[PDB]
């Protein structure tokens, strides 16, 4: 069947702290299917972006937490993990939030 | 892992202190105290070694 | 606790003098009608929503009714 | 102040050890005047008392090693300390073989590949250690069936 997951970075991108397109590119070149990070398993995992939300669809098994594993990884690359937090918004969405600081 | 304690003051492993584990709705293992195992009646013939049927043990 | 299978015997159990109140619990798959008698909490498990409303309106008068959420 | 009490009650409310209770070092005055579990529950909700995570004890090292052992690594003559029987008792090895070989004969008899007369003869040979494993037994049954079939033809 079809498994659909989304990432909500609206709050940071609206603050101009991360770019969706740069994030979008990162996912394309990393998402591993059968341990291959190049071809998205042969287009089986399609990655579609919106204005501030990135959606990932896979016709094969694909863990939601895997998106959390890469998302946090990408945040550390950009030295954002000390500000942003990845939380699940629903059964199929993660969103990025701010720690309650001042 | 979680380790158990007796729920009574009898701290010895006697024949009247046997227990069994039980997971509760609160998601913890406790001790429940079993009742002794009953025995069906033996035949009055004093010969047949088996116990009687149709009777609660 | 006792489980009741038929509506007929639930209605009767609600008419016992020792029935104190009826608890109506709605789940995603069924509606449970639980009545507290002297000894047991009898339950009627209803899988049809329509039958539930018909029953709720026909309980004996004077039995305390509580809806549970 | 002296937060021995708050450490004790927070541990009881959090259902963890006193070693996992964390008190905000910047708020000891607020915590100091929490002398009840109702107030401790409020400080827990507020975030002046938190439960520290379990210390990491990862099995990754032994999971990696156990995978190596399944391929034969770290299992040579120099890595054994108990006798061969202690590592794998003979009785258990015998028990597995007997159950396997009797299961085969039972199924072969039921499927009428052998008759009850050949089964009984083979059952007592199996008990005699004649056949080392399943395959050796199955080949012998094949050889027996052919010689019997030849005799049937000659009759």
């Amino acid at each position: 069947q079809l498994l659909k997951f989304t990432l909500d970075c609206t709050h940071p991108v609206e603050d101009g702290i991360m770019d969706a397109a740069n994030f979008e590119q990162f996912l394309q070149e990393r998402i591993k299917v059968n341990g291959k990070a190049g071809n998205l398993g042969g287009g089986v995992v399609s990655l579609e972006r919106s204005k501030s939300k990135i959606t990932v669809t896979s016709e094969v098994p694909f863990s939601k937490r895997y998106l959390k594993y890469l998302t946090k990884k990408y945040l550390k690359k950009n030295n954002l993990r000390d500000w942003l937090r990845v939380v699940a918004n629903t059964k199929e969405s993660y969103e990025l939030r701010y720690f309650q600081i001042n | 892992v979680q380790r158990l304690t007796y729920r009574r003051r009898l701290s010895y492993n006697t024949a009247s202190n046997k227990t069994r584990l039980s997971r509760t709705p609160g998601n913890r293992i406790v001790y429940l105290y079993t009742k002794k195992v009953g025995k069906a009646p033996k035949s009055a013939c004093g010969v047949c070694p088996g116990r009687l049927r149709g009777v609660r043990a | 606790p006792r489980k009741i299978e038929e509506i007929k015997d639930f209605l009767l159990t609600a008419r016992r003098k020792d029935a104190k109140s009826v608890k109506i619990k709605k789940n995603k798959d069924n509606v449970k009608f639980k009545v507290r008698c002297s000894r047991y909490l009898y339950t009627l498990v209803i899988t049809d929503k329509e039958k539930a409303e018909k029953l709720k309106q026909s309980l004996p008068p004077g039995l305390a009714v509580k809806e549970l959420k | 102040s002296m937060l021995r009490l708050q450490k004790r009650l927070a541990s009881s409310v959090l259902r963890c050890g006193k070693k996992k209770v964390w008190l905000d070092p910047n708020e000891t005055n607020e915590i100091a005047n929490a002398n009840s579990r109702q107030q401790i529950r409020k400080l827990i909700k507020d975030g002046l008392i938190i439960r520290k995570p379990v210390t990491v004890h990862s099995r990754a090292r032994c999971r990696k090693n156990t995978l190596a052992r399944r391929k034969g690594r770290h299992m040579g003559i120099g890595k054994r300390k108990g006798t061969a029987n202690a590592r794998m008792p003979e009785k258990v090895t015998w028990m597995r073989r007997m159950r396997i070989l009797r299961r085969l004969l039972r199924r072969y008899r039921e499927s009428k590949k052998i008759d009850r007369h050949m089964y009984h003869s083979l059952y007592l040979k199996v008990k005699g250690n004649v056949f080392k494993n399943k395959r050796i037994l199955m080949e012998h049954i094949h050889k027996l069936k052919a010689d019997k079939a030849r005799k049937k033809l000659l009759a």
Binding site: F99 | - | - | E30, K45, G47, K52
Partner: protein
């Protein structure tokens, strides 16, 4: 409650080394 708050408060408390003798009793000034 977010668990990273444990780190944040610990590091903040470790900053008291420079302000010995005038440590603010409560940082949550409101109330």
């Amino acid at each position: 409650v977010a668990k990273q708050r444990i780190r944040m408060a610990n590091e903040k408390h470790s900053k008291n080394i420079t302000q010995r003798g005038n440590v603010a009793k409560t940082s949550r000034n409101a109330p």
